[PDB]
Design an enzyme around this catalytic site. Structure first.
Site, PDB file in Angstrom:
ATOM      1  N   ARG A 242      37.203  31.788 -34.580  1.00 41.77           N
ATOM      2  CA  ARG A 242      36.567  30.535 -34.376  1.00 41.77           C
ATOM      3  C   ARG A 242      36.639  30.442 -32.759  1.00 41.77           C
ATOM      4  O   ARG A 242      37.581  30.996 -31.596  1.00 41.77           O
ATOM      5  CB  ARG A 242      37.001  29.454 -34.532  1.00 41.77           C
ATOM      6  CG  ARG A 242      38.736  29.236 -34.139  1.00 41.77           C
ATOM      7  CD  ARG A 242      39.172  27.554 -34.488  1.00 41.77           C
ATOM      8  NE  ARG A 242      40.293  27.407 -33.278  1.00 41.77           N
ATOM      9  CZ  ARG A 242      40.733  26.342 -33.556  1.00 41.77           C
ATOM     10  NH1 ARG A 242      40.638  25.938 -34.709  1.00 41.77           N
ATOM     11  NH2 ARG A 242      42.400  26.206 -33.536  1.00 41.77           N
TER      12      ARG A 242
ATOM     13  N   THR B 235      44.448  -5.460   1.323  1.00 44.55           N
ATOM     14  CA  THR B 235      43.766  -4.603   0.233  1.00 44.55           C
ATOM     15  C   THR B 235      43.104  -3.931   1.829  1.00 44.55           C
ATOM     16  O   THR B 235      43.613  -2.474   1.957  1.00 44.55           O
ATOM     17  CB  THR B 235      43.056  -4.646  -1.290  1.00 44.55           C
ATOM     18  OG1 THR B 235      41.850  -5.298  -0.702  1.00 44.55           O
ATOM     19  CG2 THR B 235      43.912  -5.506  -2.094  1.00 44.55           C
TER      20      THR B 235
ATOM     21  N   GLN C 228      49.069  24.750 -29.845  1.00 45.00           N
ATOM     22  CA  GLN C 228      50.145  23.829 -29.648  1.00 45.00           C
ATOM     23  C   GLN C 228      51.759  25.119 -29.408  1.00 45.00           C
ATOM     24  O   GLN C 228      51.228  25.318 -27.635  1.00 45.00           O
ATOM     25  CB  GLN C 228      51.319  23.590 -30.872  1.00 45.00           C
ATOM     26  CG  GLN C 228      50.621  22.631 -31.558  1.00 45.00           C
ATOM     27  CD  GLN C 228      49.324  22.538 -32.381  1.00 45.00           C
ATOM     28  OE1 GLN C 228      48.863  21.769 -33.130  1.00 45.00           O
ATOM     29  NE2 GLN C 228      48.280  23.515 -32.302  1.00 45.00           N
TER      30      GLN C 228
ATOM     31  N   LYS D 232      44.743  -0.858  -3.054  1.00 40.55           N
ATOM     32  CA  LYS D 232      43.122  -0.580  -2.418  1.00 40.55           C
ATOM     33  C   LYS D 232      43.261   1.152  -3.791  1.00 40.55           C
ATOM     34  O   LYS D 232      42.976   1.936  -3.181  1.00 40.55           O
ATOM     35  CB  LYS D 232      42.684  -0.533  -1.835  1.00 40.55           C
ATOM     36  CG  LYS D 232      41.420  -0.091  -0.429  1.00 40.55           C
ATOM     37  CD  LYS D 232      40.734  -1.177  -1.284  1.00 40.55           C
ATOM     38  CE  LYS D 232      40.507  -1.824   0.469  1.00 40.55           C
ATOM     39  NZ  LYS D 232      39.657  -3.505  -0.404  1.00 40.55           N
TER      40      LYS D 232
HETATM   41  N1  LIG Z   1      41.615  -8.681  -0.310  1.00 42.79           N
HETATM   42  C1  LIG Z   1      41.797  -8.760  -0.761  1.00 42.79           C
HETATM   43  N2  LIG Z   1      41.542  -9.862  -1.455  1.00 42.79           N
HETATM   44  C2  LIG Z   1      42.337 -10.886  -2.430  1.00 42.79           C
HETATM   45  O1  LIG Z   1      41.810 -11.796  -3.177  1.00 42.79           O
HETATM   46  N3  LIG Z   1      43.188 -10.832  -2.576  1.00 42.79           N
HETATM   47  C3  LIG Z   1      44.156  -9.370  -1.285  1.00 42.79           C
HETATM   48  O2  LIG Z   1      45.611  -9.444  -1.955  1.00 42.79           O
HETATM   49  C4  LIG Z   1      43.249  -8.922  -0.902  1.00 42.79           C
HETATM   50  N4  LIG Z   1      44.029  -8.202   0.489  1.00 42.79           N
HETATM   51  N1  LIG Z   2      40.976  22.480 -35.335  1.00 42.79           N
HETATM   52  C1  LIG Z   2      42.035  22.540 -35.021  1.00 42.79           C
HETATM   53  N2  LIG Z   2      42.943  22.792 -33.985  1.00 42.79           N
HETATM   54  C2  LIG Z   2      44.188  22.825 -33.762  1.00 42.79           C
HETATM   55  O1  LIG Z   2      44.860  23.434 -32.509  1.00 42.79           O
HETATM   56  N3  LIG Z   2      44.962  21.897 -34.166  1.00 42.79           N
HETATM   57  C3  LIG Z   2      44.035  20.911 -35.806  1.00 42.79           C
HETATM   58  O2  LIG Z   2      45.274  20.382 -36.218  1.00 42.79           O
HETATM   59  C4  LIG Z   2      42.680  21.534 -35.589  1.00 42.79           C
HETATM   60  N4  LIG Z   2      42.162  20.708 -37.624  1.00 42.79           N
END
Ligand SMILES: Nc1[nH]c(=O)[nH]c(=O)c1N
Ligand SMILES: Nc1[nH]c(=O)[nH]c(=O)c1N
Ligand SMILES: Nc1[nH]c(=O)[nH]c(=O)c1N
Ligand SMILES: Nc1[nH]c(=O)[nH]c(=O)c1N
Lengths: 294, 295, 295, 298
Positions: C176, C57, C228, C10
């Site tokens: 920059r 689900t 980096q 879910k």
């Molecule tokens: N409620 C519902 N509907 C589905 O097609 N498949 C499922 O597994 C569940 N739980």
């Molecule tokens: N502007 C910028 N800054 C980075 O940290 N690495 C890079 O490669 C580029 N082009």
């Protein structure tokens, strides 16, 4: 201080309805998102904390479902009409209803055979209606298409615009034109539910026309002004349906820029050699106009 | 400390390319969003602020533009392979290029039944993607997919027989709406180098087509009581119809539509056989995945 | 064909929970969005339409609510462990639960500089998240993280001495803008089950606190010419401060601000040293990653 | 046919400006998104394809950068006004400019309790906005606002004594969760031109600050039975502390949090007074609006 305006209601109510034909087996589905706001003798809920004058937002919700249960939901103009008319009628202190309806596409799929019960969201494009129901003033309806996105890779230009010291843009005789298209046509005031029902077949027919004119004009027109293209679109829609008062187009442009690659081994990719471009997310041109009868 | 894994590069590089036909005057547009990440002998950029081993991300962008100018951009499986290969061949510190491509629809408009030589409509938010992994001396891994494909069927879907215990409240049911978004991935067999890739080019569009079709056709027709059940049928046929695929993956959100009980209002009939008006739910949603390969 | 992998569950289950201190008057809220995917002996649901192996689900959804009712929901590492553990403990045929949780901020309002008993503001889109894997016979793996943290600094960033070839056009620069969203992940040493996790409860908040603070402080103070190298500094210090973390992972999508040349207009000066007005670019953007562990 | 209305222009122009004070070395950043739409005697681009009357949208974009370069960008009420005034002065055929400005938050970071001279954090998705209409000889209308302000209070909100009928299923309640986004608009009294706008400059930031704080405090303190009642208290206060405001507008979407009945499971206790776990709803939601102005009584 004083209330100069108040409305309240329920936004974003998702509604699905199915129509099962038992003869042929064929199902048909409709999905929409619905917004209802009410005006009326409600000052006092703001001024005096008085809730007795408030139809709860949750009940507005119920009413939408109840109304879809018992009435057609297509065309949206009729539904929005029935729905709004109900509010000014069930309640004495409510005198205006604004109903907004967003129609989502569920196109039947082709398996060369139309399948009787299976659909695909074939585009994010919507069909909408704004319907305002005012006591004693009848029913105003603005109908629209929006989210329709198009591109043409040539047969557009841009030259001859005002040039001053704010201008850097080069003029051009072949460029890409791309835009979202939002189009609203406004119907003549109707006097009530009545006059609205007698017109039902016009609504769908007008949408289809509006869409087709937009598509075909945009495709065949070879202009140096998006303005002029939009105006021709509006004209034909006006020409083609007597009951429409105003047509309104709003086109947000999408720029595609040329990329100069000549810095690299003298690769030629501007002008007549332009093949690769850079789609820009922003900023974007925005053009509107409203067009009415002479 | 020490660097276990490192990748860097350019994301969200919007690219458009037009093709102009000579004779016919028919034009074709391609538009994608491209992401390229590099791996290799780049640790010292992290550990010692050494930029001497960094191909600038701005340069990756120019490279994308230029490769697209001198090469076909379609099928994207090709284009990814050409672009990932360029990296490992131009740079001895780069040992792996990871190239992601999202292709956006520009369908050609139909105008009074004829197809228009140069206009198009974005006719769905649906996408066709590739992920291409080019690793020095391991050749080319390609994952092809379609995502964003949204479907509903109003009937011919059921759900009964699931486990029940003191957590269950779902009723069983023999008719229900079934709507989902489809995410579907097919993994190709490893390829040895660009060569082998060039040589399977027409299999690429053809298999995308097949995949779309099987998904669509199976979803309409299958009267099933299991989303699991339907998916697996979809995977099976795709495996069946293309030798070169090793795995098929499906990921399906299952978007729910609730019955609205209207009986408290003047006894109104809107459930069971009588359900006509329903509330689509934005959330939550069921999510069902699987990978299916051969035995 | 066989089923290589399968899970289902879910997604997007939104959950709110309030705690009332009937002593102080003081209320405290928590809101999170939860995802639970189950794995186990479930082949047959896919292969032979058999749902008797399917825990609906919907009932997964009920279970989230029920567990949240009976247990702390804070720290989310705890609750995710409690939650995934319930699934593999109560069902024979379920052998893995993957639980994902996103926690939304509801910070207490200051009204006239007094903290307020019961009002909150979404003071940021930044998230705190966990991924919790509960595998039978393998115990509990937890990845904790922060995301959606967006920062900018207007100077003290350079970029120069990177590699220059015939794909390069980028001008080198000594002042920059540096802006980026920060996605940071710290991975816990495997836990053996619910008990081990509980005895570590207070390490969780404390570590999230440190990762945040290290991130901001290092970004603000570090006058670097390599993103980096900044990321790596952040990661050492996180490892130095908390023994129980195995790796630290940084994903930095960084956002460009371009200079706008305005000299064609009355020779106006808006570049290099005179730069004041800039154009923020929505895309493309650079993306820099690494995983740092202990040697 | 006839052109009844036409506007064209540039939307989504992203703009950043940096102000460096080299005394202290403190740096301050502004970022905003700008939209400018022009009106005036441009009918002919539409009816007759005549491009000679169009200022190209690319030129509107240049003009935004140049103006931001030569002027202060803050408060956005001034900037907008400058920006709009420029178009009516530079061009005879242009009689109105509509300027929309969204400002984005970059708040100064605190490192170890000290403001940092040059690092900032996007601390909220809340926006501060202006709409500025600069029309030939009607001067300058200015709608200011905040939006994106999301708040929740988990008790001290009620809802009972509303109309009941055969459409009603809603239970009356005396303790419930109240959450909303706040969208709030103050309309200034018309100004006669730029001049008048510069001499009110300090009142701009102060009214935004008051508006925000009145909103926060009223929302937190009011024990209301009516969102309406509460929005009205906010507007009244704003109106009492700034004379130059004519109207206040509030628009509040209310996000619902439903109770979850868990009693079918081991008799579990989760409604009214023992409600602890709720299901926040994405949709639908209530939407309450109002414009509040000055009374004509004495
Ligand atoms: N409620 C519902 N509907 C589905 O097609 N498949 C499922 O597994 C569940 N739980
Ligand atoms: N502007 C910028 N800054 C980075 O940290 N690495 C890079 O490669 C580029 N082009
Ligand atoms: N639920 C709710 N809450 C309000 O404060 N006002 C309202 O009008 C409704 N319907
Ligand atoms: N730059 C540009 N492009 C258009 O198509 N139309 C326009 O009006 C402008 N100004």
């Amino acid at each position: 201080s004083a209330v100069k305006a108040a409305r309240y209601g329920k936004d974003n109510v998702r509604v699905y309805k199915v129509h099962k034909d038992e003869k042929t087996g064929v199902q048909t589905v409709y999905e929409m998102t619905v917004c209802v706001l009410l005006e009326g003798e409600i000052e006092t809920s703001y001024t005096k904390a008085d809730n007795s004058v408030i139809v709860a937002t949750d009940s507005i919700k119920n009413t939408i479902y109840i109304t879809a249960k018992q009435n057609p939901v297509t065309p949206p103009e009729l539904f929005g009409s029935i729905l709004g008319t109900h509010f000014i009628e069930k309640y004495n202190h409510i005198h205006a209803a604004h109903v907004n309806i967003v129609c989502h596409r569920w196109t039947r799929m082709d398996i060369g055979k139309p399948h009787p019960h299976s659909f695909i969201r074939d585009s994010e494009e919507k069909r909408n209606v704004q319907v305002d129901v005012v006591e004693g003033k009848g029913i105003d309806i603005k109908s629209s298409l929006s989210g329709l996105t198009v591109l043409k890779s040539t047969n557009s230009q841009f030259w001859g615009f005002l040039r001053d010291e704010y201008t850097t843009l080069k003029e051009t005789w072949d460029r890409i034109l791309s835009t979202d298209v939002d189009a609203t046509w406004q119907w003549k005031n109707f006097s009530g539910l009545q006059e609205v029902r007698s017109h039902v077949p016009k609504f769908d027919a007008t949408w289809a026309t509006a869409r087709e004119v937009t598509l075909k004009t945009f495709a065949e027109d070879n202009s140096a002004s998006v303005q002029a293209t939009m105006y021709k679109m509006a004209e034909q829609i006006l020409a083609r349906q007597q009951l429409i008062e105003t047509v309104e187009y709003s086109l947000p442009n999408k720029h595609y820029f040329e990329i100069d690659l000549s810095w690299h081994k003298g690769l030629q990719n501007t002008g007549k050699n332009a093949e690769v471009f850079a789609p820009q997310s922003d900023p974007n041109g925005l053009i509107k106009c409203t067009v009415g009868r002479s």
